[PDB]
Write a protein that binds this ligand. Structure first.
Ligand SMILES: [Mg+2]
Ligand SMILES: [Mg+2]
Ligand SMILES: [Mg+2]
Ligand SMILES: [Mg+2]
Lengths: 414, 414
């Protein structure tokens, strides 16, 4: 028989990995934040002469050779390559020996908003140029958005939970929350969890341009400017973040080095507009409150907010309103999309890494680029330079296309 | 403060909705099963002259006019239309008054494996024929796989959890399991949950043909033949199933009519091959056992298995092996993909409806088409005609591309 009651478990972070426009190790990634070096510049992945958008945050130095060989491009779109690299880096960082685990209690969640969209565009064209017999056998294994999760599970022998979650910009915030809840409620002992996106393509840029969602600002240093009066759309980035989560008991029993604790998760829905956030941040308020309630902390204990902060007029008006409503005007807020661009399905995972690293360095990274915050924005937006401070608890927001709100609360470790 | 312990809740089904190749109401859908009328025939959605596959299970009578008007095609791909129709039908069936609910405790999960893939193919072509300025503004709101969930939430004012899950063929089995766990652990009181797919398109058929995953059998009555010695690939279907799940307390307090109870969920990963299931069903065995353990039932109590049963050599060899290993050679097994085709991300939701309807009618639907089961298959495969019997508990399997195994256990209600 099963018990009537479940005794809750604590959940800790033991390692992480990243490939991104500002670095491919936590040390490189943090150094960019601490020195004020952004990753936005002119697009190089395709000819963008006919577009209205000419900037993106690219990974121009992906360390392909560390783990892969040429034949791996037959099997993996970049959206999977990025996840596999970040997952191996996270396993290494955690000093996790996957051959010593209970593999039935080891799971994987790899979120993505769009999946292998380069593969889709290129094979649609091949179909219509050459006919159906010439579509590549590996088209769907490369393209379908769940495949990165299955690929990561195969690499590490994870026989437990394996899934992908899609909530657009919230996808990897929801992934980390779901993995946290799995471990908290006793289903798994170890989860590799995060997100990945590789959507700097003609089609995906054209689609977001058609939605009027992208900044058309020519100067790459003035294009991603969250909370700034001149903001006018997001700048697309690419990459992956992956975290190792463990039960506290599992981590301590094996002598792991613990990097942070996950303590709360809030997920709500605006049920308001298909792509615009609620203008007063109504769903965002409720998501923040849920995360704090689960973590058993008061608003005054939150010492940093890593904002969703995509650099749109509507987003930061509501998001500042939501943060002020729940937490007030003193808590420091910054958006690191000013450095990384908008990583879409990978945004929550990379921003969880930002938040953990901020707690471990006693340092709130600035919002790069921003100079003049809108008059009506009442939140304590950090810009110009970062802030030295103790950060015992912090939250990271994502408020995504489709109305999906997700907030994670983290606690500094001992 | 939060408790140290969570008191578990029971979870019940109060309504469901369906659009599918064998019907667009539970009554039509069941009647097709009870009379032996399949939904597979020649493709009509595109010119398939150049293809090797000429059959599919289409919805050729979608009741567009019941809820939609012409302008809705500007906003919604068919993958969202199908989900919105099935969700409204489920709400109606449940006699759920969405204006009387706690909307913060009302959530939505709409699974999909591929999302608005017609929109993607058609707008890729527009991009390359006319240039980026001519890509339609609603391209990504129509295409992205999370949008159906957000659309359903907006229709009903669901302000709680809103997400999409992608585990290919397992997507809506995992969706229903996730919603079940949310309610069981006290996060939500009511969830609208299921899946949707609209992938009978040149691109998606060409992709599955290139994977060698589709039956090339010309006779539509011999193409989807799960467990049969002549099986040679799946037949693609389309549509959506949506269920209303409630806590037992919420359902009884409002005087709902209860249709079934959800009692267990097992999710594991083969971590074996990217698209082929483990040949001996090793991950499937563990997923079945997890569902039974959570439901607190013994193997002998399972009275029907709705198989994954896609009509591939490798699938049914391992799946029969897994069923025999855990449950033995007497429990009746049938695959209704013989009627509906493979609904991909919608398969688990429509098959949950099959399973519930079987329990409510005291009737195991047959596997249509199949005549001669492979010599090595030891499971009690029902074919030729369905079986009259009491079904107090039942399970439904999905074992999807990427290694994702999901099993749901249901209990008949009082
Ligand atoms: Mg660098
Ligand atoms: Mg954030
Ligand atoms: Mg009919
Ligand atoms: Mg099934």
């Amino acid at each position: 028989p099963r018990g009537s009651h479940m005794k809750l478990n604590r959940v800790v972070v033991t390692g992480y990995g990243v490939t991104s426009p500002i670095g491919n190790t936590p040390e490189e990634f943090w150094n960019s934040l601490a020195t004020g070096k952004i990753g936005i510049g002119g697009i190089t992945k395709f000819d963008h002469s006919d577009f209205d958008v000419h900037n993106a945050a690219e990974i121009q130095d992906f360390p392909f050779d560390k783990y892969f060989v040429k034949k791996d491009t037959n099997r993996f779109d970049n959206y999977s390559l990025y996840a596999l690299y970040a997952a191996q880096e996270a396993v290494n960082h955690a000093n996790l020996d996957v051959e010593a685990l209970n593999r039935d209690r080891f799971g994987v969640i790899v979120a993505s908003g769009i999946g292998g969209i380069k593969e889709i565009e290129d094979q649609v064209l091949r179909l219509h140029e050459k006919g159906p017999k010439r579509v590549k056998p590996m088209t769907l294994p490369k393209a379908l958005p769940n495949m990165a999760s299955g690929n990561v599970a195969m690499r590490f022998g994870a026989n437990g939970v394996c899934k992908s979650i899609n909530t657009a910009c919230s996808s990897s915030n929801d992934a980390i929350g779901d993995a946290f809840r799995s471990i908290k409620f006793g289903f798994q002992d170890v989860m590799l969890v995060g997100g990945t996106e590789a959507s700097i393509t003609p089609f995906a840029i054209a689609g977001f341009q058609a939605l009027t969602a992208l900044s058309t600002t020519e100067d790459p240093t003035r294009a991603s400017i969250p909370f700034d009066k001149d903001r006018n759309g997001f700048v697309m980035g690419e990459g992956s973040g992956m975290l190792v989560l463990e039960s506290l008991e599992h981590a301590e029993k094996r002598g792991a080095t613990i990097l942070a604790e996950v303590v709360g998760y809030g997920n709500t829905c605006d049920a308001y507009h298909m792509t615009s956030p609620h203008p007063e941040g109504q769903g965002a308020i409720k998501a923040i409150k849920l995360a704090l309630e689960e973590a058993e902390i008061s608003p005054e204990q939150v010492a940093y907010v890593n904002a969703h902060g995509t650099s749109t007029p509507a987003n930061e008006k509501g998001e500042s309103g939501a943060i002020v409503a729940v937490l007030g005007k003193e808590v420091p807020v910054s958006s690191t999309k000013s450095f990384t661009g908008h990583l879409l399905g990978a945004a929550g995972a990379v921003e969880a890494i930002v938040t953990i690293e901020a707690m471990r360095h006693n340092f709130v990274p600035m919002t790069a680029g921003t100079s003049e915050v809108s008059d009506y924005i009442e939140a304590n937006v950090v810009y110009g330079q970062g802030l030295e401070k103790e950060i015992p608890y912090a939250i990271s927001n994502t408020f995504g296309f489709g109305g999906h709100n997700a907030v994670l609360a983290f606690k500094r470790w001992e």
